[PDB]
Design a protein around this ligand. Structure first.
Ligand SMILES: Cc1cc2nc3c(=O)[nH]c(=O)nc-3n(C[C@H](O)[C@H](O)[C@H](O)COP(=O)(O)OP(=O)(O)OC[C@H]3O[C@@H](n4cnc5c(N)ncnc54)[C@H](O)[C@@H]3O)c2cc1C
Length: 500
């Protein structure tokens, strides 16, 4: 008796999962011949290459616990194997007599390298590998091909390409396993009945004092429920315009499906279909790029450019990225990283990010503009790395790609338009309710100067119980001075790049 193995990495869902469906149908179409091991590998190598903050460790824990629960309802379970894939797979290929391995493809360089090695090993041991592209709606390889070898570098060109492509068939959940006995204990399972059990919170979250509020639980179960709730107001869905959603409402003004799509707890292909049904129903609706379908297309867009450039996440050797002489300022970077810039709007966003792990898209704009071309002149690679630690949705391609946009390093080139850290939030939060929540030390400043507490006299600062320089920091820079200087720096950078 040989085993069929589905390998979770992303695609942490039962629904719309061709790679996992195939395994299950195979076992049910040939009962008595196959064991089924759905596995997720706790790969220590990922830590040598990426940073993970407490909140995202908890999201994953929650995700794996839900996936194990969902798999039990199909008379299976999640096997969480600890160790490196390069060492893990040779063992289990033998100990399990693995006939077929399926997994969902990924375009990240670490994923490509890892997967190539695993396919070299599987080919040696005579293991059949089947992979499916279901993390995205469109196959970036097919988009690049349809565009004659190059990724489209504008959204509009990208849309024109994928319009001519076939939308994939969205699958249901796999059928339950008919007469599938519990797999036989292997070398590790026999010395430890729990060696493959889902990790506890304690095992995954080493810094539990860094956990913030539990607001967006992980798990395919929570994703589908959050999607169903988001779609309930079909008018809100149909007439959604991303630019008109607020960055600083107390309640998220968008869906907050990003953590679920990032991990694959929600299929983008299912979400796209559900959106296309509502749009059909609602003749007055928005259109890309501002619409909700437009937002899934931005995801597709960035995954397509990123699949063609292994160096997508750095400035050097990145075909898309303007070479810009960012400066090194450790103290300004620390202040930004911990929301101690002295600009309440900027500090409120960064504290929301560290405490909760999600901030609105225009909040990401504000703070990213500040760190890079706006104010501090610090490389987008430094803000990427902070976002990478803190974000529940941390995604290689988007964190990369949107940082390049925001710094005017690629895709976006109107660097003379600069967000004001004082004025930008006022449009949608004149009272500064958001600031009061996330910067509580300023909670007694009136709306007139909560965005600019340095406009309050010392007497008033003491009255509000928050003296700048003691209870809340002075501005680490003067926006009105630096942002003009950075515009000229940017113009010089652009000139140099144009001449090379
Ligand atoms: C500096 C910066 C860093 C970012 N880093 C990430 C990241 O690491 N992970 C991430 O998922 N998104 C990232 N984004 C894009 C965007 O800010 C988030 O996707 C969005 O805020 C998620 O909120 P939501 O799910 O409510 O979005 P909605 O507006 O509800 O959109 C639904 C989905 O569409 C996709 N989407 C929305 N906006 C964008 C966008 N601008 N680009 C690409 N896809 C988009 C996401 O899958 C999102 O879940 C980043 C943007 C910026 C400016």
């Amino acid at each position: 008796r040989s085993t069929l193995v589905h390998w979770f990495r992303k695609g942490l869902r039962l629904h719309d999962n061709p790679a996992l469906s195939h395994i299950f149908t195979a076992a049910n179409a040939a009962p008595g011949r196959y064991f089924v091991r759905p596995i997720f590998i706790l790969d220590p190598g990922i830590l040598d290459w990426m940073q993970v903050g407490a909140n995202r460790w908890r999201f994953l824990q929650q995700t794996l616990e839900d996936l194990d629960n969902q798999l039990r309802k199909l008379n299976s379970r999640l096997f969480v194997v600890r160790g490196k894939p390069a060492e893990v797979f040779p063992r289990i290929f033998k100990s399990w007599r693995v006939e077929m391995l399926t997994f969902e493809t990924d375009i990240e360089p670490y994923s490509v390298t890892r997967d190539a090695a695993v396919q070299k090993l599987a080919k040696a041991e005579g293991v059949r590998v089947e992979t499916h592209c279901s993390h995205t709606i469109y196959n970036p390889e097919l988009v690049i091909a349809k565009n004659l070898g190059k990724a489209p570098i504008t959204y509009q060109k990208f849309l024109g390409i994928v319009e001519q492509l076939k939308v994939p068939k969205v699958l249901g959940v796999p059928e339950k396993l008919k007469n599938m006995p519990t797999p036989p204990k292997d070398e590790v399972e026999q010395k430890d009945s729990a060696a493959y059990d889902c990790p506890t919170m304690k095992q995954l979250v080493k810094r539990p004092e860094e956990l913030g509020p539990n607001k967006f639980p992980g798990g395919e179960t929570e994703a589908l429920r959050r999607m169903e709730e988001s779609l309930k107001d079909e008018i809100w869905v149909a007439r959604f315009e991303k630019p008109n959603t607020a960055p600083n409402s107390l309640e998220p003004s968008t869906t907050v499906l990003s953590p679920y799509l990032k991990f694959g707890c929600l299929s983008a292909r299912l979400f796209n279909q559900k959106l296309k049904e509502i749009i059909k129903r609602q003749p007055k609706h928005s259109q890309p790029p501002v619409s909700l379908i437009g937002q899934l297309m931005w995801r597709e867009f960035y995954y397509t450019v990123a699949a063609a450039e292994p160096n997508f996440d750095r400035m050097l050797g990145n075909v898309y990225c303007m070479q810009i002489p960012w400066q090194e300022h450790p103290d300004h970077l620390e202040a930004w990283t911990h929301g101690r810039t002295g600009y309440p709007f900027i500090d409120a966003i960064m504290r929301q990010l560290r405490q909760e792990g999600w901030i609105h898209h225009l909040a990401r704009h504000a703070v990213a503009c500040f760190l890079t071309r706006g104010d501090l002149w610090i490389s987008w690679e430094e803000g990427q790395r902070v976002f990478e630690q803190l974000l529940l949705d941390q995604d290689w391609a988007l964190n990369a790609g949107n940082w390049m946009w925001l710094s005017a390093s690629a895709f976006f080139h109107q660097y003379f338009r600069v967000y004001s850290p004082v004025a930008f939030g006022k449009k949608t939060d004149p009272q500064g309710h958001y600031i009061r929540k996330y910067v509580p030390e300023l909670s007694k400043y009136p709306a007139g100067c909560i965005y600019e507490p340095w406009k309050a006299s010392l007497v008033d600062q003491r009255a509000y119980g928050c003296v700048l320089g003691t209870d809340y920091p002075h501005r680490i820079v003067k926006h009105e001075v630096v942002h003009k200087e950075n515009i000229k720096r940017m113009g010089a950078a652009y000139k140099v790049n144009r001449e090379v």
